[PDB]
Amino acid sequence: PLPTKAEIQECTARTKSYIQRLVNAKLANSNNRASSRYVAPANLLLNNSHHIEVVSKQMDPLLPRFVGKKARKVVAPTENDEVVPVLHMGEADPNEW
């Protein structure tokens, strides 16, 4: 069966929102006071006993924002959980080939 209709109006919705989150996440990153025009306590820690409140700090505009971002190279591991079986279905041939 082809995937109905009201099924795609879902995947399109959630995917669209997610991509917007990535894009807007990026446009606020880089160096342009220009590029920003195209754009909650939330923490129950442990048992929530002490709660939390999270608040951002405004950076001194001159000083570097993202004090820790520094270009460096990394080799990533490949964590192999499971094996994908590779399942397929000469003699005189070499004299040809």
Binding site: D60, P61, L62, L63, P64
Partner: protein, 193 residues
């Protein structure tokens, strides 16, 4: 911050390089505020970084257009009168300072020494009697209820006699052409065409 060798400046040094991005802006805002000949010393509002990283001149110069033309043209006449007058006119040498002399601190040398009066003009007592008083003020009209908005200084309004005198003084800079028909093949559309 003139002398800093200390470790305590590890941030301020980082702070300097950052401001290096915003300097040419500060050069603009500084340079459009030049005091002009008839004024002695302009006084500006600077916005500085608390660590002394850089100093912005925060304003934009506003001048009444007819008044500004009057002022500048008055200076024009004074220029001509003075070029005709004195025999030896001496153009100052460039650059003003030699490379080894550090820039002299304003809080010592300059602030004590008095302005040494500017251009202005003799004007006239009788003819200009309306406009002789405030013509050369830094901001020409600040306190008036009728003549100007207020200290925010936008939306000038005048009377007839004043505009008569301003119209009189600005003759050397005035457009002088009284009719449209004078421009025949010189308007824009003849240039585009």
């Amino acid at each position: 911050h003139s002398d800093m060798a200390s470790k305590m400046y590890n941030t301020d040094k980082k702070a300097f390089l950052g401001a290096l991005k915003y300097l040419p802006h500060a050069i603009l805002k500084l340079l459009e505020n030049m005091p002009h000949p008839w004024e002695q010393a302009k006084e500006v509002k600077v916005l500085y970084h608390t660590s002394g990283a850089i100093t912005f001149v925060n304003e934009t110069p506003r001048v009444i257009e007819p008044v500004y033309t009057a002022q500048w043209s008055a200076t024009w006449i004074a220029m001509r009168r003075e070029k005709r007058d004195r025999t030896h006119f001496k153009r100052m040498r460039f650059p003003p300072f030699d490379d080894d002399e550090p820039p002299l601190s304003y809080e010592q040398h300059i602030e004590n020494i008095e302005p040494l009066d500017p251009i202005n003009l003799p004007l006239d007592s009788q003819d200009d009697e309306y406009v002789k008083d405030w013509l050369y003020d830094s901001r020409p009209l600040e306190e008036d209820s009728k003549k100007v908005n207020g200290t925010s200084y936008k939306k000038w309004s005048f009377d007839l006699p004043e505009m008569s005198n301003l119209y009189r003084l600005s003759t050397p800079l005035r457009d002088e052409v009284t009719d449209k028909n004078y421009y025949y093949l010189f308007d824009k559309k003849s240039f585009f065409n």
